[PDB]
Amino acid sequence: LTLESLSNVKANSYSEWITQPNVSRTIARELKSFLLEYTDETGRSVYGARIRTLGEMNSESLEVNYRHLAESKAILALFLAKCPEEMLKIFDLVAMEATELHYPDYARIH
């Protein structure tokens, strides 16, 4: 959806709002945008550097910084702060999707 679509909140439970089907899809797309679009000062990719790291040392973890995401999209950072039980699960899936986009067929490694 839109950035302000997440801002307009209407649900009885905060985690239910996060896991609202349309809202959940919006969260997935917005996280995809945050990871694919955010770039360092010198034009070097932040998430590009992280995926370059992951491709060669083949770890099962990615060191995603909270501050850069916060100045990227405040609503998603606040969703993480209030209800990290659900967004992290989505963020793992979108991270895997982006890794496949850069390095396809990563199932055997991890």
Output the smallest distance, CB 7 to another protein, in A. 12
- One-letter identity of residue 80: L
Contact string 77-106 vs another protein (x = CB under 8 A)? ---------------------x--xx----
Where does 3-80 show beta strands of DSSP type E?
none
By the rule CB under 8 A, 71 interacts with another protein: yes
At 2, the amino acid letter reads T
Going by the DSSP 8-state scheme, the letter that residue 42 receives in this structure is T
Part of the chain binding another protein (CB under 8 A), chosen from 10-18, 36-44, 54-62, 76-84: 36-44
Smallest distance from another protein to CB 16, Å:
14
- Judge whether 63 and 91 are in contact, CB under 8 Å: no
> Helix 84-102 to helix 74-82 angle, to the nearest 10 degrees?
130
H or E segment and range at residue 77 = helix 74-82
Using CB under 8 A, list all residues that contact another protein.
Answer: 2-3, 29-30, 32-33, 36-37, 39, 43-45, 47-48, 71-73, 98, 101-102
